[PDB]
Design a protein around this ligand. Sequence first.
Ligand SMILES: Cc1cc2nc3c(=O)[nH]c(=O)nc-3n(C[C@H](O)[C@H](O)[C@H](O)COP(=O)(O)OP(=O)(O)OC[C@H]3O[C@@H](n4cnc5c(N)ncnc54)[C@H](O)[C@@H]3O)c2cc1C
Length: 270
Amino acid sequence: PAITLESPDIKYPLRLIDREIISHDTRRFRFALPSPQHILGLPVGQHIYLSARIDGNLVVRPYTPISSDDDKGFVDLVIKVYFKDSHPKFPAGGKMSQYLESMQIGDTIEFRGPSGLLVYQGKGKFAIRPDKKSNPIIRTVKSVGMIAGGTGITPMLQVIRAIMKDPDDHTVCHLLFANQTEKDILLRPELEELRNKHSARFKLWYTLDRAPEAWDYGQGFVNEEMIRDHLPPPEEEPLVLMCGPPPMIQYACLPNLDHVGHPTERCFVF
Ligand SMILES: Cc1cc2nc3c(=O)[nH]c(=O)nc-3n(C[C@H](O)[C@H](O)[C@H](O)COP(=O)(O)OP(=O)(O)OC[C@H]3O[C@@H](n4cnc5c(N)ncnc54)[C@H](O)[C@@H]3O)c2cc1C
């Protein structure tokens, strides 16, 4: 099979072939690989880099795909667009996300990778480099806790999809997914389809900054009780994965993980 990202030092221009509106500000962007028989070449859990020249600046941003090496001919990204003239303190908006939003079908952008400190090697085995300098440390776990906000769902879905497609993978994933309003719950159909098909290995819970009137899940920021009730208990010695805005990690996740009893050595932030 042909690998797209043959070298991590080479930038590969890929063409946009599809673009799906997921919410008011978030899209799934599908790019064609060099041939329909190509695969991306992305170990489970890692990310890529997009680069482009935008107004005299060389903009480089990382993005974690939701597709896998099982997907021939394409790669899927899920990107939130930081629109201009929308936020008072940031009137110019975000550079890369608005550039992607303006891309027409067929337009190209340079991909590079893979990159990242975590790789899922299957059957509960996670290879995590303690820092950018060291070799990966292997620890096998029976369950994984997952806290995501917004597009932080993308690395989690990469791991969830890899586990569920293997019938001999008995790892159990518990996902706590936090967003602002109900319309901001990205990839809800895909998540609930996986939960309804693999309910013994996949537990799923939402919280919202502002919930609707009829709401069966959580309301408010991630807190101590949500982690206690919807992540695996610390006695199982699970791995706890996190992806979201740095302030949500700093204020909502890390202190409340300490409160429940999940040690820092068993936690990882994408
Ligand atoms: C490892 C990793 C993985 C990532 N994976 C993903 C992914 O899968 N999907 C994804 O969408 N992003 C992902 N990101 C985030 C991504 O790399 C960028 O930070 C994001 O796309 C913003 O880049 P930008 O150039 O569009 O905005 P920038 O030009 O970098 O904007 C600067 C900052 O200003 C703020 N800002 C600007 N305009 C607004 C606005 N209108 N409202 C609110 N705040 C605003 C934001 O905080 C923004 O980051 C990932 C980041 C990392 C480090």
